Amino acid sequence: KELSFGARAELPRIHPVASKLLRLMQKKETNLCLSADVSLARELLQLADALGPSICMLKTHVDILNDFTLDVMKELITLAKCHEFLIFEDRKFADIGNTVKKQYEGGIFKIASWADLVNAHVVPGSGVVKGLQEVGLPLHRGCLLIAEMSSTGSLATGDYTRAAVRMAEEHSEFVVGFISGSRVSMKPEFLHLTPGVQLEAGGDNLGQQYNSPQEVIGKRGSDIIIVGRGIISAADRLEAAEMYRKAAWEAYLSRLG
Amino acid sequence: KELSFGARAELPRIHPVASKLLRLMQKKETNLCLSADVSLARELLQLADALGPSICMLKTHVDILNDFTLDVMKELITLAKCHEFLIFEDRKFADIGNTVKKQYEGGIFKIASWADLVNAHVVPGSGVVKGLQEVGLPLHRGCLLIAEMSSTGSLATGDYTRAAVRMAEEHSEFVVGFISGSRVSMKPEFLHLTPGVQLEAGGDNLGQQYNSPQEVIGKRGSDIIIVGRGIISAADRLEAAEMYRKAAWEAYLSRLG
Numbered sequence A, B: 001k002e003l004s005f006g007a008r009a010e011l012p013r014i015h016p017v018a019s020k021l022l023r024l025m026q027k028k029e030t031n032l033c034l035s036a037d038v039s040l041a042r043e044l045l046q047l048a049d050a051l052g053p054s055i056c057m058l059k060t061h062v063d064i065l066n067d068f069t070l071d072v073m074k075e076l077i078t079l080a081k082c083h084e085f086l087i088f089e090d091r092k093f094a095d096i097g098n099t100v101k102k103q104y105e106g107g108i109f110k111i112a113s114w115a116d117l118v119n120a121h122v123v124p125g126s127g128v129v130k131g132l133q134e135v136g137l138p139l140h141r142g143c144l145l146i147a148e149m150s151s152t153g154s155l156a157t158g159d160y161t162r163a164a165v166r167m168a169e170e171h172s173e174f175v176v177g178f179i180s181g182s183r184v185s186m187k188p189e190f191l192h193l194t195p196g197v198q199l200e201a202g203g204d205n206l207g208q209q210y211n212s213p214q215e216v217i218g219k220r221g222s223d224i225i226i227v228g229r230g231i232i233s234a235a236d237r238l239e240a241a242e243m244y245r246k247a248a249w250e251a252y253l254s255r256l257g
């Protein structure tokens, strides 16, 4: 039988980052992750402040910010703390373990210093997770494994998906869930976050495909929707975020009973 | 029957970036790509200058440079032009097409402005290539697809590898070859570049596994070796680069007949 987000936050094997997330999802009645796909720091921060109460998570691509500085990420943290959401840097680490460790901790971005969550592809084998965890464990961070992809021609299917689930369930000290289209693990300790979400049917011109919040949270059993253009391209981004929040939240409630 | 690098440079379907690379490989008698895995710009540039005559390519991870600026990449270009080698940013693009387009052109790194070559994982489907090509084609660049990985537990095997080959062979206006452990395409227009290379047997503590230049270039039929620590950790990096260059070049000559 299905547990609420609040009860899942208490599970024996829950990761502290997962528990923090699940608690604020329950408190705020939001399972929406804003994909803050903008190139300006000022727009990122204005969106984070205005939409903060509507979201459980803000997903970044800091490598697309034209004016990235670590001070921008300090300001983002201030907002994340005020409004209570996690920061997820969507870096898709996908190299050998020795390399990703440095990409996570170092360089200009110093991702591990400000990101609560990051994600990784499983294609390199479990060394990708072991390399990240060398940095992420001492910094009390979590990681999401990409088990499925929303794009046309995705190879993250079948045995590849199963390998991602196995990898997560064997690195549960650091891996807190999946990026996936559907529930892929039967262990309620793991989060499922689903991108490729819009209210209307369609896609983009570069292989992105959309499903609705009701479809992915209800029928497909995911936990959280990740929404970029469905919100960002709207004239009123706050009203769009509220539309997506209500859709995902109701879908969850109805699945729960 | 096997063609020399110089003859491959003249093939009807050759990409201009591949032809430039093959020409300089033949001229300089090198099929060594230095993996310049350092965190200091000064060390990067000192290696590029000293080892430039020994290498056909210098592979970067600019997201590990602690002091990246675009002026560092301008100085790297000066050296690449002087010594005649290509710059390969090992970014492993691995997102939906719409996202990778921005990660390639924009942000702080502006990768497309200075990298002759980049690479991509094929897991998202061919939209990853189509997104990159919408920046890379107008900038006259090339891309390599990751068809296999050197690390323990790699999922880039079987039908996944075949899908990478199909994707390359269908985007030949932009994709110039592979990162792989072995020959994966039987079309000589495509380059094969192989990482996980050191003279001695072994590996690292995060899943990297090594094979020798003779094994990779001779028996496995690859074109170019990519070497990081085997060179970078040596006391005399120039002597190490020469050892690797001679090994890979003579393996090529012997396979050619």
Ligand SMILES: NC(=O)c1[nH]nc([C@@H]2O[C@H](COP(=O)(O)O)[C@@H](O)[C@H]2O)c1O
Pocket: A035, A037, A061, A090, A146, A148, A149, A150, A151, A179, A195, A196, A197, A208, A226, A227, A228, A229, A230, B095, B096, B099
């Ligand atoms: N793993 C996946 O299946 C996957 N699909 N999309 C994304 C990311 O999620 C966002 C989707 O954006 P929008 O289409 O505008 O809603 C975008 O940042 C993209 O990079 C992702 O990680």
Ligand SMILES: NC(=O)c1[nH]nc([C@@H]2O[C@H](COP(=O)(O)O)[C@@H](O)[C@H]2O)c1O
Pocket: A095, A096, A099, B035, B037, B061, B090, B146, B148, B149, B150, B151, B179, B195, B196, B197, B208, B226, B227, B228, B229, B230
């Ligand atoms: N199979 C693959 O695709 C693959 N294996 N290694 C690398 C990259 O090549 C380099 C290997 O480094 P070193 O072990 O020191 O010789 C390093 O930068 C790593 O990120 C890579 O792209």
